[PDB]
Paper text:
To assess ligand-induced conformational changes in [name] [name], we determined its structure in unbound form to 2.80 Å resolution. The CDR1α loop underwent small yet relevant movements (rmsd in α-carbon positions of 1.7 Å for residues 27–30) that enable CDR1α to engage the RLQ peptide via two direct and three water-mediated hydrogen bonds and 10 van der Waals contacts. CDR1α Glu29 showed the largest individual displacement (2.3 Å in its α-carbon position). Vα residues 57 to 62, which are distant from the [name]–pMHC interface, were in unambiguous electron density in both free and bound [name]. The 57–62 loop adopts markedly different main-chain conformations in the two structures, with rmsd in α-carbon positions of 4.7 Å. Vα Glu61 showed the largest individual displacement (7.9 Å in its α-carbon position).
Here, we studied an HLA-A2–restricted spike protein epitope (RLQ) that elicits CD8+ T cell responses in COVID-19 convalescent patients characterized by highly diverse TCRs. [name] [name], like [name] RLQ3, was isolated by screening CD8+ T cells from COVID-19 CPs with RLQ–HLA-A2 tetramers. To explain the ability of [name], but not RLQ3, to tolerate the T1006I mutation, we determined structures of [name] bound to RLQ–HLA-A2 and T1006I–HLA-A2. These complexes show that there are multiple structural solutions to recognizing RLQ and thereby generating a clonally diverse T cell response to this epitope that assures protection against viral escape and T cell clonal loss.
Numbering used by the authors:
A (entry chain B): 2 to 245
B (entry chain A): 2 to 181, 184 to 202
């Protein structure tokens, strides 16, 4: 349908070669590569038209190369990668008949290049059942989820009520917290809330699950530590309804 | 000479009230386009509005409207009857020698109107433990400043507004936890409403 980017998340060690791939919209002829951070904003890197580069002045002097082998595929290689490469990389495409054509944006790839993988941890997920004072006082029931101790910040939290994903009545922190607020290595914590009516929580036939998708190491990566290798995984916590 | 300046980097608006997001530009080519892009927390870029240089200033009563001052090279974005779904980052963009030049953005936050505030600090307990605890500050008014922690071992999240999507209900919520700590003392560095409920 829209502009496709692969991968979506990437967590890798420095020195590795990072390959980002984009597929423009069918029929589109210009393709743009952007970068986003908080300090520099939306930064044009390079953009093509009919598979020919038009402006690559935004490309760094070293380690960044991009090419478009055919009309529906472009790549952007970072070799070798560095920690400062960590950003959200966007690919956009237009019809390519005018410089003023509307740009459609893909979902973007969040790339985190680490110094080393010694500090990577998956999250621990705990669900906290609604206060009975809150049920008594407001006739509503708030569930709280805590995803704690993960690094880096590549987590996606989601609530699943009765096997199906819900979005209403759910507020999760826009930004996580540093457990050690004075460390570059510091692992993160993240909280969520799912508030339902007292009637819905007190039905023991309702199933609540807090799901946290973590993005970490891959198959190619290696592990020289006697703790569980922090691969990409999904850590869940769940609770059943309680009438009393 | 293709610039886009969004000087106010953060903006707030009361729910259902009107906010104007500023943008000024400089260009060289007299044939340019102007854009507004919305970026929700998903990081997806969605085009809000799009204007052409040598066309009129619209006589449009849509919820998302534009104020185009070509002589002043200004390009406001007006949002009427603001909703909580409007809370996102907004980028003003130019289209000249470079097809798209972005401004540095404006984080717009939409304050929910809480008309039935029931400030309370509750204690929840773990489904599989019920010995590791959390404290939930909830249902306070939207002007309440809940601030971060001071202890190195107590963690306080900022407030979060949820929309139950039924009964037009909204509620603010902040979480605090610490393995050490009691709920009656968790948010006492934030100015708590006088009528806050401690069961």
């Amino acid at each position: 349908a829209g502009v496709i980017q692969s991968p979506r998340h990437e967590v890798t060690e420095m020195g590795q070669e990072v390959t980002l791939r984009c597929k423009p919209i069918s029929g589109h002829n210009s393709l743009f590569w952007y970068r986003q951070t908080m300090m520099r904003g939306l930064e044009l890197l390079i953009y093509f038209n009919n598979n020919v580069p038009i402006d690559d002045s935004g490309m760094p002097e070293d380690r960044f190369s991009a090419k478009m082998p055919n009309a529906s595929f472009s790549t952007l290689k970072i070799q070798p990668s560095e920690p400062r490469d960590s950003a959200v990389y966007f690919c956009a495409s237009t019809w390519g008949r005018a410089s003023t054509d509307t740009q459609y944006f893909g979902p973007g790839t969040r790339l985190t290049v680490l110094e080393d993988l010694k500090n990577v941890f998956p999250p621990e997920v705990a669900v906290f059942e609604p206060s009975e004072a809150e049920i008594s006082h407001t006739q509503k029931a708030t569930l709280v989820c805590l995803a704690t101790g993960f690094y880096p910040d590549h987590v996606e939290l989601s609530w699943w009520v009765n096997g199906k994903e819900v979005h209403s009545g759910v507020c999760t922190d826009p930004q996580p917290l540093k457990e050690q607020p004075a460390l570059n290595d510091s692992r993160y914590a993240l909280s969520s809330r799912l508030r339902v009516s007292a009637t819905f929580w007190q039905n023991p036939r309702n199933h609540f699950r807090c799901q946290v998708q973590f993005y970490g190491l891959s198959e190619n990566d290696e592990w020289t530590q006697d703790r569980a290798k922090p691969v990409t995984q999904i850590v869940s916590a769940e609770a059943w309804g309680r009438a009393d | 000479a293709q610039t886009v300046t969004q000087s106010q980097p953060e903006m707030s608006v009361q729910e259902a009230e009107t906010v104007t997001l500023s943008c000024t530009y400089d260009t060289s080519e007299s044939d340019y386009y102007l854009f507004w892009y919305k970026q929700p927390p998903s990081r997806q870029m969605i085009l809000v509005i799009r204007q052409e240089a040598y066309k009129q200033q619209n006589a449009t009563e849509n919820r998302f409207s534009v104020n185009f001052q070509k002589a002043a090279k200004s390009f406001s974005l007006k949002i009427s009857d603001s909703q909580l779904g409007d809370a996102a980052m907004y980028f003003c963009a130019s289209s000249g020698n470079t097809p798209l030049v972005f401004g540095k953005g404006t984080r717009l936050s939409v304050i929910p109107n809480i008309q039935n505030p029931d400030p309370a600090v509750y204690q929840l307990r773990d489904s599989k433990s019920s010995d590791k605890s959390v404290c939930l500050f909830t249902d306070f008014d939207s002007q309440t400043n809940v601030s971060q922690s001071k202890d190195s071992d107590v963690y306080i999240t900022d407030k979060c507004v949820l929309d139950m999507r039924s009964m037009d209900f909204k509620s603010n919520s902040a979480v605090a936890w610490s393995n050490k700590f009691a709920c009656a003392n968790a948010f006492n560095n934030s100015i708590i409403p006088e009528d806050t409920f401690f069961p």
